[PDB]
Design a protein around this nucleic acid. Structure first.
Length: 134
RNA sequence: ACUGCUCUUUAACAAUUUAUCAGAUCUGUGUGGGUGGCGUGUGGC
């Protein structure tokens, strides 16, 4: 509710970030200004704002040859969701493959484009090597 | 400590009923166009 789902409490921010292209600090500023969210540990809020570090590219660079399609064609919602889910394990190292990927599959159902989970799960099998000591 | 372990490689068609051989006008700036009603009073004839 609070710890894990925290991600999907602020993927909006990510989305808006990946659409606004402004200062991420002001991004979280306007986001917390939008509503008082209590299903998120503010430490995970700081993680989400830390999810700006350039390895973002690298994590899509992680799958850059491991892609079924192009990158920009992956919608901004999928872009942000997958980018933060890989920011868990590509630079932040929060949890193993099963836990974080169950998260990335369950907490994108109220945002996906009616089929997002199939492709994110089929391409996220790259999450197995990124933590090989699974 | 003590709600939280993969669901498995992206949108997912409406179009529809004789019938066919396709079957000259692109003007104006000539110009009229850019204080009274009523009442009362007075006086006159």
């Amino acid at each position: 509710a609070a710890r894990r789902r925290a991600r999907e409490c602020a993927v909006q921010a990510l989305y808006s970030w990946q659409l606004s292209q402004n200062d991420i600090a002001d991004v979280e500023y306007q986001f917390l200004a939008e509503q008082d969210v209590k299903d998120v540990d503010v430490l995970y809020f700081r993680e989400l704002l830390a999810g700006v570090a350039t390895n973002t590219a690298y994590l899509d660079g992680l799958m850059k040859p491991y892609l079924s399609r192009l990158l920009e064609e992956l919608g901004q919602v999928e872009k942000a969701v997958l980018r933060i889910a890989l920011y868990e394990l590509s630079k932040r190292s929060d949890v193993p493959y099963k836990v974080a990927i169950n998260e990335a599959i369950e907490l994108a159902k109220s945002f996906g484009a009616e089929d997002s989970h199939k492709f994110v799960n089929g391409v996220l099998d790259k999450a197995a090597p990124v933590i090989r000591p699974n």
